[PDB]
């Protein structure tokens, strides 16, 4: 298929079937439910190639081959009515960016652009034109796609448009009205006093402003960018206040500067870390080595609330992506290392699973539902973290939507505009913390993606776009820069976010005390139609701005080319504090302004407001029983199991993850905080926790803020930190500013933490952000409706960790034990604004609060003493759902029972069980009870401490008060109820057979959990005699663009005695490396090309289609003694390279998981008998391994191929269930692979490929669960030692 398309030609190539049978059945069921008689539907991918020159036969065959990927679903002959769904004209999918990159890296420069659609063939002969429109509506996303009736209509996607010129606004010819008109036309949202300021500035300059100048100004002066509310003066109840909100936050730093290296002068804060071996490849040698130095710790938390209400996948994705850029742009360049995630939404109202507190109150047409946010949003956030490669290790998820009698009387309070929160930690070198100086003449660079018309102005302008692989490429350049140490050529770096370059470039010169002169036509653009305003102001993603000295440009160019990171020099820093943007195409100057004019401020805001305070109503208990309350509370999403948010996201990339959300042998997501190691050679590390309690703010603003700080501390407390001054906070404030009562409430809550609680505890808040229009208004029938959030403070706590090995979790032991409650509520047992109240549609009277500051500190210090002395068996703090939920979660994690007496906790059993006061349950050895009680007493806590009882083997969850049974249930029954939410979410989002299998396994109490059988001594270093010689063979640690798991791969080989060499595919292509110098090769994990065109396919085909590099690989694999390993993405790659690999004829392909979802699991495997030299000595072992993949499902051609592979004896690993049997049941087998197959070898055993990641778990400390008696080495270390010994 191939036709004229302007000065280019467009080719049409049919792809493979696009939807599996469950997805097809879902569509048919949706049509049936809407009364559309659709007899059948079939979907095929179709590819469009815009060509600038022709393809010869050989090139055409290459292109056709590149576009063969994906699971081998059965093709159907087209039949019925064609509906073709594509991206909207004027947009370029991320798919297109990455597929085009692959074509170019395969030598197809004739390809100008590849794009993809889905051709739907619908047989429904009896449908009206009206009903056809409804069909079309079901098949596409109106915010990013369109529907066409012919394949040839895809030509519209590639139309070339001539550059649009700059437009002036005619102030001199029309007066002020020109500015008023432009304000409305351009959507500038300017205030009257801003229009005054612009009017005078341009009158003084004696010329008309250009549209681009006004837009730039308007962006820079928004609430989003200027923080007017947080810098305002206040008057409250008639009294002027002494400090802004910002100054009150800064009070915490004035009080507690300890350990802080950077606060309030970058887009992340920095604190002291630990001296450890930072592991990376040297610039000159390419060898990975440990560099003993301080790894300091950066932190940042952001939000993306409004875009996520409009288009949740990209909203969440670019929420993560922007925050990752803030981290990498800290100082003079730094390295992200782990993420966190938060969602607050309205009620889910899951079809067929509606809960008794949920009422449908309507919503605006133009936003999505709470359910669609929680379906697509987490996938988007995860897509970014997975493809960029940072593990996502802690988070929160709250539902809230109720009609309540709050501060402004009876009104709807909720999250129709959601909280979408993304944050994280990173490491940074001491000499890079401070931004450098920008010398006059510095070159000013944009690093990253070509711009498009995104973010300007159905709300299309709020529809974002993410390409995480592009950002990984950029991160690698940043890494190379900071890895040069004193020769780091980055003088200054900053992320590109709101306002695009129009904010970022002025900010970067201005932060250096410089001006800039810029050339518009040097900026990389994928949309030649764009105006200067669009080019300068678009919010295209994956971009950074930086300054480099002119003499370092050749170095910078080398770094970028090797990573394949696009970059452009677009201007020069000037001594004069002026901003100039020239346009070589139109020979004119779109921007010509002094910086003081541009960056000049209208006056400060004054907010004159009054306090409103809600009168609580006592909880009406008419319909409440304890048993009913347990069942309801376990069904509140806020409380309920969070698996659907957890296993979708990588938790092992870097090899530094010590404590992830999933805990114990039954992998129950209840960990109270995240912990990473500082390096691959240390037990020092970092921790992250979150505290939040928004519904409390409907009753008491300051208490909600104090509880958020408190809960962050209780979540983190059983991790070995020491001095509380080591804990640093981000404070993210979400409010509906201007809503009656909220402004005074905001001030009071900031004051409560910044002026009071944080200084009194010794907690700094060195970073934070604010989002101040958290409400939603619409017309619902004949009436105005509004849904307003509670004031919503989210606190994230971050700390350097003294020993990651000493972290406690909620996993109860059944050795002889005591359960003790630390009730920091001091028996107040408040029920206001609890999960209990919410699930009966009420708010209640009085909420929890921090009852006693000294006791909170004493709790923290006492926990630190108990952790360091190793006196705790377990800890779980009390939060949503109260003591009942803390104890239940502990019993789920320990897969056991409890026998608990609550007679000491008051006569009100409901209140004792369901209050959400601060504190929690510690478990200690029985023999240590008296000593632990005495320790707690030393910290002033005796009256808060209560012996509850003990954990016991079995399935009974029993709560007594004297001789009365208060509540008694099967622990399994509770655990399954608690699972029903994630069950239902998985069920609607993923393959329902997998969701059901996962859920139903939880009901089998006989599940023994992950468990280990070892065929060898895991402590025996069989490589030691080799290492002792000092002779270290090289390993080629192979990476392609988008690979992310190479550093820990190198480290694993290093520990086994190799010299690990960084080999990029660019090194092979440029002659800098030749495989003939190596005896061992490893293809590493990640998302090369974002897996576009099938995971590992672009990587492999780039090798196959370059005859030189293809020959190199083939030569390597045909040598008699060479060894090769392919892990995950490398396994996929090597499976696509079979034709070069002897003995690989029976290998399968690796395709989309049967669940249709990314699976980040800690899975049980057995090592099976095969020739594999890398698994020698390990046959019959059974131990868990990190799994992190979406396309790991072994796929054979037919059963003859599966039988042949099996009979040849080439299977080397298989998934087993916890009973130890080979399985295809999910998630024990996470991807649906037949016969549990997840590793294969060649006939000679010299090449092994596997989907799981042994290199992520070679350290015991990095295994989510492991036997207590293991040393530093896990079983998986033996793979790398076997490689060493085999080389001799």
Ligand X SMILES: Nc1ncnc2c1ncn2[C@@H]1O[C@H](COP(=O)(O)OP(=O)(O)O)[C@@H](O)[C@H]1O
Question: Do the Cβ atoms of 675 and 685 come closer than 8 Å?
Answer: yes
880 assigned to a ligand binding site: no
Closest residue to ligand X, Cβ-based? 395
Residue span binding Mg ion (CB under 5 A) among the ranges 399-407, 467-475, 874-882, 1251-1259:
874-882
**Cα dist. 264→250, 326, 764, 856 in Å?**
8, 13, 12, 27
Taking the complex as a whole, the smallest distance from the CB of residue 649 to ligand X amounts, in Å, to 6
Stretch in the footprint of ligand X (CB under 6 A) among 389-397, 1036-1044, 1090-1098, 1157-1165: 389-397
- Exactly one of 444, 634, 671, 1175 binds ligand X (CB under 6 A); which one? 671
Q: Minimum distance between the CB of residue 888 and ligand X, rounded to whole angstroms?
A: 11
User: What minimum distance in Å lies between the beta carbon of 662 and ligand X?
Assistant: 8
Which of 338-346, 770-778, 788-796, 1084-1092 is the region at the interface with ligand X (rule: CB under 6 A)?
Answer: 338-346
State which residue, 396 or 556, has the beta carbon closest to ligand X: 396
Taking CB under 6 A as the rule, does residue 343 contact ligand X?
Answer: yes
**Is residue 315 marked as binding?**
yes
Judged by CB under 6 A, the stretch of 335-343, 351-359, 534-542, 746-754 that binds ligand X is 335-343
Q: Is the separation of the CB atoms in 669 and 661 below 8 Å?
A: yes
**Which residues ranging from 692 to 721 are in contact with Mg ion (CB under 5 A)?**
715
Q: Pick between residue 716 and residue 1100 the one whose CB is nearest to ligand X.
A: 716
323 is a site residue for Mg ion (CB under 5 A): no
- The reply on whether position 712 binds ligand X by CB under 6 A is no
Longest alpha-carbon distance in the chain? 91
d(Cα 378, Cα 384) in Å, to the nearest integer? Answer: 10
Measured at the CA of 106, the angle between CA 105 and CA 111, to 5 degrees, comes to: 85
Q: Is residue 995 a known part of a binding site?
A: no
The yes-or-no answer on residue 306 being catalytic is no
> Could you tell me which stretch among 608-616, 824-832, 875-883, 1007-1015 binds Mg ion (CB under 5 A)?
875-883
Binding status of residue 424 toward ligand X by CB under 6 A: no
The rounded distance, in Å, linking the Cα atoms of 531 and 555 is 33
The answer to whether residue 1084 is catalytic is no
Q: Between 737 and 893, whose beta carbon lies closer to ligand X?
A: 893
Give the E-state strand segments of 1131-1181 in sequence order: 1149-1151, 1159-1167
1020 is in an annotated binding site: no
> Does the footprint of ligand X cover residue 645 (CB under 6 A)?
yes
Q: Are strands 111-123 and 40-51 parallel, antiparallel or unpaired?
A: antiparallel
Least distance CB 661 / ligand X (angstroms): 3
CA distance 642 to 1056: 38
**DSSP H or E run through 350:** none
Q: Is 1132 within 8 Å of 1096 (Cβ atoms)?
A: yes
Which residues are CB-neighbours of 536 under 8 A, at least 6 positions away? 212, 215, 216, 500, 501, 502, 520, 581, 590, 591
Per CB under 6 A, does 396 bind ligand X? yes
Q: How far does Cα 898 stand from its chain's mean position?
A: 35
Q: Closest Cα partner for 26 from 9, 15, 38?
A: 38
Q: How far is CA 150 from CA 81, 95, 117, in A?
A: 10, 21, 12
Element (H, E) at 192: helix 192-205
CA–CA separation, 240 vs 1230, rounded Å?
61
Q: Site map for Mg ion, 939-978, x if CB under 5 A?
A: ----------------------------------------
Q: Of 1078, 1139, 1143, 1140, whose CA–CA distance to 1114 is shortest?
A: 1140
Please pick, among 304, 358, 1255, 1266, the residue that the annotation labels catalytic: 1255
Q: Please, what is the end-to-end C-alpha distance for the chain in angstroms?
A: 56
Between CA 209 and CA 167 the distance in angstroms is 9
Distance CA 163, CA 586 (A): 9
Q: Residues 1129, 1251: contact at Cβ < 8 Å? A: no
- Regarding 669 and contact with ligand X (CB under 6 A), the answer is yes
Residue 140 backbone dihedrals phi, psi, to 5 degrees = -145, 160
Q: What is the 3-state secondary structure (H, E, C) of 1031-1061?
A: CCCEEEEEECCCECCHHHHHHHHHHCCCEEE
Q: Nearest distance from residue 757's CB to Mg ion, in Å?
A: 18
H or E segment and range at residue 601: none
Return the one option of Mg ion, ligand X, none that residue 1053 interacts with (CB less than 5 to 8 A, by type).
none
* Contact status: 917 vs Mg ion (CB under 5 A): no
Q: Are the beta carbons of 1039 and 1250 closer than 8 angstroms?
A: no
- Find out whether 21 is annotated in a ligand binding site: no
Residues within window 877-896 making contact with ligand X, judged by CB under 6 A: 879-880
Among the residue ranges 80-88, 642-650, 965-973, 1083-1091, the one whose residues contact ligand X (CB under 6 A): 642-650
Q: Parallel, antiparallel, or unpaired for β 674-677 and 657-659?
A: antiparallel
Cβ closer to ligand X: 509 or 793?
A: 793
Is 395 annotated for ligand binding?
Answer: yes
Is 643 labelled as part of a ligand binding site?
no
Q: Quick check: 374 binds ligand X (CB under 6 A)?
A: no
Which of 879, 950, 1088, 1241 is the binder for Mg ion (CB under 5 A)? 879
Residue 414 CB, nearest approach to ligand X (Å): 18
Judged by beta carbon, residue 188 or residue 383, the one nearer ligand X is 383
285 annotated as ligand-binding: no
Alpha helices in 438-552 (DSSP H): 468-482, 501-511, 532-537
Nearer to ligand X, 209 or 669 (CB): 669
Nearer to Mg ion by Cβ, of 464 and 715: the residue is: 715
Give the count of residues interacting with ligand X (CB under 6 A).
Answer: 19
The reply, when asked if residue 319 is annotated as ligand binding, is yes
Give the active site residue among 106, 994, 1128, 1131.
1128
Give the DSSP letter string of 1205-1220.
Answer: HHHHT-EEEEEB-TTS
Is 320 marked within a binding site? yes
Residue 711 annotated as part of some ligand binding site: yes
Site string for ligand X, 861-880 (x = CB under 6 A): ------------------xx
User: Is residue 642 a contact residue for ligand X (CB under 6 A)?
Assistant: yes
Binding part of the chain for Mg ion, among 113-121, 672-680, 825-833, 847-855 by CB under 5 A, reads 672-680
Residue 396 assigned ligand-binding role = yes
316 is in an annotated binding site: yes
Query: Do you find a cis peptide bond into 1121, omega within 30 degrees of 0?
Result: no
Q: How far is the CB of 396 from Mg ion (least distance, A)?
A: 5
661 binds, among ligand X, Mg ion, none (CB under 5 to 8 A by kind): ligand X
Q: Which of 8, 296, 909, 1253 is catalytic?
A: 1253
Could you say whether residue 877 binds Mg ion (CB under 5 A)?
yes
Q: How far is CA 573 from CA 18, 212, 498, 819, in A?
A: 50, 21, 22, 64
Rounded Cα–Cα distance for residues 188 and 1077 (Å): 61
Binding at 571: pick from Mg ion, ligand X, none (beta carbon under 5-8 Å per type):
none
Q: Which stretch binds Mg ion (CB under 5 A): 41-49, 99-107, 199-207, 666-674?
A: 666-674
Which of 641, 672, 917, 1166 is in the footprint of Mg ion by CB under 5 A? 672
Q: Which does 1236 bind (CB under 5 to 8 A by kind): ligand X, Mg ion, none?
A: none
Q: Is 481 a catalytic residue?
A: no
What is the distance, to the nearest Å, from the Cα of residue 157 to the centroid of all Cα atoms in its chain? 31
Count CB neighbours of 291 within 10 A: 15
* 1025-1029: long-range contacts, CB 8 A cutoff, minimum separation 24: 1026/1057, 1026/1284, 1026/1285, 1026/1288, 1027/1056, 1027/1057, 1027/1284
For position 916 contacting Mg ion by CB under 5 A, the verdict is: no
Q: Does position 753 bind ligand X by CB under 6 A?
A: no
Give the footprint of Mg ion on this chain (CB under 5 A).
672, 715, 877, 879-880
Specify binding-site residues. 315-326, 394-396, 671-672, 711, 715, 877, 879
Give the footprint of ligand X on this chain (CB under 6 A).
341-343, 392, 394-397, 642, 645-646, 661, 669-672, 715, 879-880
| Residues labelled as active-site residues | 1128, 1253, 1255
């Amino acid at each position: 298929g191939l036709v004229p398309r302007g000065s280019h030609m467009m080719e049409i190539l049919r792809g493979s079937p696009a939807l599996s049978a469950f997805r097809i059945n879902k569509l048919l069921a949706r049509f049936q439910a809407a009364n559309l008689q659709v007899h059948n539907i079939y979907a095929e991918y179709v590819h469009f190639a815009d060509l600038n020159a022709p393809l010869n036969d050989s090139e055409q065959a290459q292109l056709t081959r590149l576009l063969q990927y994906g699971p081998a679903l059965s093709s159907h002959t087209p039949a019925g009515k064609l509906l073709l769904v594509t991206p909207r004209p004027g947009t370029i999918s991320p798919w297109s960016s990455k597929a085009t990159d692959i074509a170019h890296n395969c030598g197809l420069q004739q390809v100008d652009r590849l794009e993809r659609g889905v051709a739907y063939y619908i047989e429904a002969s009896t449908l009206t034109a009206e009903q056809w429109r409804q069909v079309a509506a079901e098949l596409h996303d109106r915010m990013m796609e369109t529907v066409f009736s012919s394949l040839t209509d895809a030509e519209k996607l590639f139309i070339h448009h001539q550059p649009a010129p700059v437009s002036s606004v005619d102030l001199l010819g029309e007066g002020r009205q020109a500015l008023i008109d432009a304000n409305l036309r351009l959507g500038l949202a300017l205030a009257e006093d801003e229009i005054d300021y612009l009017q005078e500035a341009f009158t003084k300059l004696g010329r008309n402003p250009n549209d681009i100048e006004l837009y730039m100004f308007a962006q820079a002066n928004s609430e989003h960018c200027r923080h007017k509310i947080f810098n305002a003066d206040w008057i409250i109840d008639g009294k002027p206040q002494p400090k802004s909100l910002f100054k009150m936050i800064k009070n915490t730093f004035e009080t507690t500067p300890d350990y802080v290296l950077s606060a309030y002068k970058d887009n992340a804060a920095v604190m002291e870390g630990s001296a450890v071996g930072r592991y990376f490849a040297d610039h000159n040698t390419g060898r990975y080595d440990f560099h003993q130095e301080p790894a300091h710790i950066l932190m940042k938390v952001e939000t993306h609330n409004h875009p996520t209400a409009i288009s949740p996948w990209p909203g969440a994705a670019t929420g993560s992506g922007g925050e990752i850029r803030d981290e990498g742009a800290t100082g003079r360049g730094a390295k992200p290392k782990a993420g966190l995630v938060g969602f607050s939404v309205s009620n889910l109202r899951i079809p067929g699973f509606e809960q008794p507190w949920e009422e449908d109150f309507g919503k605006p047409e133009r936003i999505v539902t709470a359910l669609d946010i929680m379906t697509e949003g987490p996938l988007g956030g995860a897509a970014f973290n997975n493809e960029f490669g940072r593990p996502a290790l802690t988070g929160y998820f709250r539902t809230y939507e109720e009609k309540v009698n709050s501060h402004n009387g009876e009104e709807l309070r909720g999250y129709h505009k959601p909280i979408m929160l993304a944050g994280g930690i990173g490491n940074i070198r001491a000499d890079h913390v401070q931004k450098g100086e920008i010398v006059v003449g510095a070159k000013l660079i944009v690093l990253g993606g070509p711009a498009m018309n995104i973010g300007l102005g159905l709300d299309f302008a709020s529809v974002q776009r993410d390409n995480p692989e592009m950002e990984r490429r950029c991160q690698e350049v940043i890494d190379r820069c900071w890895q040069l140490g004193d020769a780091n050529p980055i003088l200054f770096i900053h992320d590109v976010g709101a306002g695009g370059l129009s904010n970022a470039m002025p900010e970067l010169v201005s932060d250096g005390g410089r001006g800039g002169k810029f050339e518009l036509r040097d900026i990389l653009s994928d949309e030649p139609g764009m105006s200067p305003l669009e080019i300068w102001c678009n919010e295209s993603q994956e971009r950074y701005v930086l300054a480099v000295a002119a003499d370092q440009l050749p170095l910078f160019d080398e770094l970028c080319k090797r990573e394949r990171a696009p970059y452009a020099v677009i201007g020069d820093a000037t001594e004069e504090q002026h901003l100039s943007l020239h346009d070589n195409h139109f020979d004119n100057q779109p921007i010509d302004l002094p910086l003081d004019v541009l960056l000049g401020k209208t006056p400060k805001m004054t907010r004159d407001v009054q306090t409103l305070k809600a009168k609580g109503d006592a909880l009406n208990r008419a319909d409440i029983t304890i048993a009913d309350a347990v069942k309801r509370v376990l069904h509140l999403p806020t409380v309920a199991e969070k698996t659907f948010l957890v296993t979708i996201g990588d938790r092992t990339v870097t090899g530094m993850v010590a404590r992830d959300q999933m805990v114990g042998p039954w992998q129950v997501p209840v960990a109270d905080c995240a912990v990473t190691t500082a390096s691959l050679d240390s037990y020092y590390g970092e921790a992250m926790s979150i505290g939040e309690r928004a519904p409390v703010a409907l009753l008491d603003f300051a208490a909600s803020a104090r509880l958020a700080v408190g809960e962050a501390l209780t979540n983190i407390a059983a991790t070995q930190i020491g001095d509380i001054k080591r804990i640093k906070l981000s404070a993210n404030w979400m409010a509906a500013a201007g809503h009656p009562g909220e402004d005074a409430g905001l001030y009071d809550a900031v004051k409560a933490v910044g002026e009071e609680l944080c200084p009194q505890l010794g907690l700094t808040i060195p970073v934070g952000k604010d989002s101040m229009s958290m409400k939603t208004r619409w017309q619902e029938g004949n009436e105005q409706r509004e849904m307003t959030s509670p004031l919503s403070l989210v606190i994230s706590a971050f700390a350097r960790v003294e020993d990651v090995r000493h972290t406690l979790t909620p996993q109860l032991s059944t050795e002889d034990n005591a359960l003790l409650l630390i009730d920091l509520g001091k028996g107040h047992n408040a029920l206001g604004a609890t999960a209990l109240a919410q699930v009966y549609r009420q708010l209640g009277d009085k909420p929890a609060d921090v009852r006693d500051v000294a006791q909170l500190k004493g709790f923290y210090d006492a926990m630190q003493a108990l952790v360091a002395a190793r006196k705790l068996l377990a800890w779980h703090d009390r939060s949503d759902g109260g003591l009942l939920v803390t104890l239940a979660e502990m019993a789920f994690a320990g897969h056991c029972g409890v026998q608990v007496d609550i007679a000491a906790l008051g006569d009100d059993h409901l209140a004792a069980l369901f209050n959400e006061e601060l504190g929690g349950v510690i478990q200690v050895r029985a023999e240590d009870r008296d000593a632990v009680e005495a320790l707690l007493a030393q910290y002033g806590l005796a009256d808060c401490v209560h012996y509850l009882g003990q954990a016991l083997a079995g399935d009974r969850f029993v709560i007594t008060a004297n001789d009365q049974t208060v509540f008694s249930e099967s622990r399994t029954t509770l655990r399954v109820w608690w699972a029903e939410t994630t069950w239902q979410m998985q069920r609607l989002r993923d393959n329902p057979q997998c969701a059901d299998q996962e859920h139903e396994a939880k009901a089998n109490d006989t599940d023994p959990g992950l468990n280990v059988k070892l065929s060898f001594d895991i402590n025996e270093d069989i490589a030691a005699p080799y290492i002792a010689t000092g002779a270290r063979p090289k390993v080629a640690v192979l990476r392609e663009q988008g690979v992310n798991s190479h550093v820990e791969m190198a480290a694993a080989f290093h520990r086994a005695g190799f010299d690990a060499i960084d080999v990029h595919m660019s090194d092979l292509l440029g002659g800098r490396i030749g495989l003939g110098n190596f005896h061992a090769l490893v293809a590493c994990g990640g998302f090369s090309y974002g897996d576009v065109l099938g995971a590992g396919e672009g990587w492999a085909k780039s090798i196959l289609f370059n005859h030189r590099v293809r020959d190199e690989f083939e030569t390597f694999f045909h040598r008699p003694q060479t060894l090769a390993l392919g892990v995950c993405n490398g396994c996929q790659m090597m499976s696509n390279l079979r034709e070069l690999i002897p003995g690989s004829e029976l290998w399968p392909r690796f395709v989309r998981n049967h669940s249709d979802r990314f699976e980040a699991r800690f899975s049980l495997v057995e090592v099976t008998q095969s020739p594999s030299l890398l698994l020698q000595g390990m046959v019959g072992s059974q131990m868990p391994i990190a799994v992190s993949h979406g396309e790991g499902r072994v796929e054979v051609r037919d059963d003859a191929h599966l039988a042949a592979l099996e009979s040849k004896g080439l299977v080397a690993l298989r998934y087993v269930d916890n009973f130890g049997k080979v399985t295809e049941t999910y998630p024990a087998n996470p991807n649906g692979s037949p016969n549990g197959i997840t590793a294969v070898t060649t006939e000679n055993g010299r090449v092994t490929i596997m989907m799981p990641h042994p290199e992520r778990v070679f350290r015991t400390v990095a295994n989510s669960w492991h036997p207590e008696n293991w040393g530093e080495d896990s079983p998986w270390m033996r793979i790398f030692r076997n490689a060493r010994k085999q080389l001799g």
